[PDB]
Design an enzyme around this catalytic site. Structure first.
Site, PDB file in Angstrom:
ATOM      1  N   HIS A 102       0.808  -1.180   0.151  1.00 38.97           N
ATOM      2  CA  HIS A 102       0.109  -0.145   0.000  1.00 38.97           C
ATOM      3  C   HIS A 102       1.022   1.265  -0.016  1.00 38.97           C
ATOM      4  O   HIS A 102       0.544   2.303  -0.836  1.00 38.97           O
ATOM      5  CB  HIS A 102      -0.923  -0.037   1.485  1.00 38.97           C
ATOM      6  CG  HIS A 102      -1.855  -1.218   1.101  1.00 38.97           C
ATOM      7  ND1 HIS A 102      -3.354  -1.278   1.995  1.00 38.97           N
ATOM      8  CD2 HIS A 102      -1.958  -2.398   0.494  1.00 38.97           C
ATOM      9  CE1 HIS A 102      -3.744  -2.394   1.623  1.00 38.97           C
ATOM     10  NE2 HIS A 102      -3.337  -3.078   1.003  1.00 38.97           N
ATOM     11  N   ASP A 109      -5.500   5.230   2.931  1.00 33.90           N
ATOM     12  CA  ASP A 109      -5.951   3.987   2.528  1.00 33.90           C
ATOM     13  C   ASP A 109      -7.221   3.641   3.140  1.00 33.90           C
ATOM     14  O   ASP A 109      -7.202   3.888   4.523  1.00 33.90           O
ATOM     15  CB  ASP A 109      -4.751   2.962   2.876  1.00 33.90           C
ATOM     16  CG  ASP A 109      -5.072   1.581   2.757  1.00 33.90           C
ATOM     17  OD1 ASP A 109      -6.035   1.041   2.615  1.00 33.90           O
ATOM     18  OD2 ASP A 109      -4.157   0.808   2.875  1.00 33.90           O
TER      19      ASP A 109
END
Ligand code: UDP
Length: 440
Positions: free
Chosen positions: A13, A106
């Site tokens: 990520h 995120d």
């Protein structure tokens, strides 16, 4: 001033969000990587063009994940400490004359959105999973699909032109098709979408040509804009290199397209028996291979299996995966088919042997074999076990089969379209430019 907040310690990520942040710096924005106090103390920082800042997950001196291995417990701890410390950081940064323009976060940290919006900071969700998986989770969040999600539900989505392939039982995302197995991951997957409509922007690390129906549906439904593959510009042939890692020296000595790279990522764990089947399959294939077996898993490897792997293979705890995939010696990638690994294979035109576990991997593996045509998926026996014979069969099927050229052809095709998307004027480049102007 553009804050970037990946899920802490998830490199899959982190990397793509940093690469987005580099392109924003090209356009003259100022990116800051936001990580935990632990990760900050124990990891080198990213360097220019990035600042770094910290929040806390409750565990500033040890790994919180290690201490709290029950996922729901770690996630409630991270929420409580993270939400507090993120609010403090937004204020300290403003007081230091660096007020945050936008927080790109995120959505596996859905509390980040509320914290930022309450500080008056714009928010941009950054999805690091494929549109095909993302949109299934969003349908459950929006209360259009019940749990569990079924193949029949997926067939509807195919029929309606939203999914590009028909997902069977082994292809639907297990976090929503078998939610009892992973309760905390089920809820986290669906909560990504709760409140996403309140964001200023929604971004996804994919490209429209790879996932055309799914990207279109994510754009119409969630305002999601493709901005990937979010990888270093060198790999995308974007003109707007070479390490000293010892495994790369090994690779230089192997013949063109000869080597199998093998990794099951940084998250999943394989027991001794699964390692034995995997490693024996590799040796029985006869191919040279670069096997990544993490430091925290390698105690599970026997002396005799390691010795068996010396004939033609190399075992390492980590490799520079993009540089490997770009290497002329690399022939295929036996991968768990996490999204970052899959994108990295596509950008390099490398055919895949898919060995998925969970998360987005079963769905990606179905795309790889049945729509994209860039590899094959390993078949588990009646009792769910991956056999050495099947590992071997799949390696040989991609490297030597009657269909060898089919997997190569598709990998190459997709490679070109991934580069087009990120180069100037490409579909993802346009979305990046839009965002950069918005926040200038
Ligand atoms: O030995 C390595 C070396 C690099 N990476 C990089 O770490 C990121 C996360 O990888 P992982 O396979 O866990 O991601 P996923 O494919 O599941 O999304 C990707 O950028 C990889 O290229 C890795 O995972 N294993």
């Amino acid at each position: 001033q553009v804050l970037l907040l990946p899920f802490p310690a998830a490199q899959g990520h982190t990397n793509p969000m940093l690469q987005f942040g580099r392109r924003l710096a090209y356009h003259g924005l100022r990116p800051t990587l936001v990580t935990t106090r632990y990760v900050l103390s124990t990891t080198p920082p990213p360097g220019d063009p990035f600042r770094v800042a910290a929040i806390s997950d409750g565990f500033d001196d040890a790994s919180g994940m290690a201490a709290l291995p029950d996922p729901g417990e770690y996630l409630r701890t991270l929420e409580a400490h993270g939400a507090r410390t993120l609010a403090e950081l937004l204020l300290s940064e403003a007081r230091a004359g660096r007020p945050a323009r936008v927080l790109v976060y995120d959505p596996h940290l859905p509390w980040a959105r509320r914290v930022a919006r309450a500080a008056g900071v714009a928010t941009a969700a950054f999805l690091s999973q494929p549109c095909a998986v993302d949109l299934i989770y969003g349908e459950v969040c929006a209360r259009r699909l019940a749990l569990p999600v079924t193949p029949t539900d997926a067939r509807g989505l195919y029929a309606r032109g939203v999914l590009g392939v028909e997902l069977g039982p082994d292809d639907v995302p297990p976090f929503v098709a078998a939610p009892e197995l992973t309760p905390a991951f089920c809820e986290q997957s669906i909560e990504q979408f709760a409140g996403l409509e309140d964001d200023d922007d929604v971004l996804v690390n994919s490209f429209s040509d790879l996932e055309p129906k799914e990207a279109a549906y994510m754009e119409s439904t969630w305002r999601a804009k493709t901005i990937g593959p979010s990888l270093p510009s060198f790999y995308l042939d974007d003109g707007r290199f070479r390490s000293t890692v010892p495994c790369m020296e090994w690779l230089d000595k192997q013949p063109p397209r000869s080597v199998v790279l093998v990794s099951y990522g940084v998250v999943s764990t394989f027991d001794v028996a699964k390692l034995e089947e995997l490693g024996n399959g590799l040796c029985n294939s006869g191919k040279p291979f670069l096997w990544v077996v993490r430091s925290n898993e390698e105690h599970k490897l026997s002396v005799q299996l390691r010795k068996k792997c010396e004939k033609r293979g190399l075992i390492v705890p980590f490799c520079p995966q993009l540089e490997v995939l770009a290497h002329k010696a690399t022939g295929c990638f036996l991968s768990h088919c996490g999204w970052n690994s899959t994108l990295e294979a596509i950008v390099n035109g490398v055919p895949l042997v898919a060995m998925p576990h969970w998360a987005d991997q079963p769905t990606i593996s179905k795309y790889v074999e049945s729509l994209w045509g860039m590899g094959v998926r390993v078949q588990l026996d009646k009792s769910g076990i991956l056999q050495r014979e099947e590992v071997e069969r799949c390696i040989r099927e991609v490297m030597d089969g009657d269909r060898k050229e089919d997997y190569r052809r598709n990998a190459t095709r997709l490679m070109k379209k991934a580069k087009e998307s990120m180069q100037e004027g490409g579909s993802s480049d346009k979305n990046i430019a839009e965002f950069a102007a918005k926040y200038s």
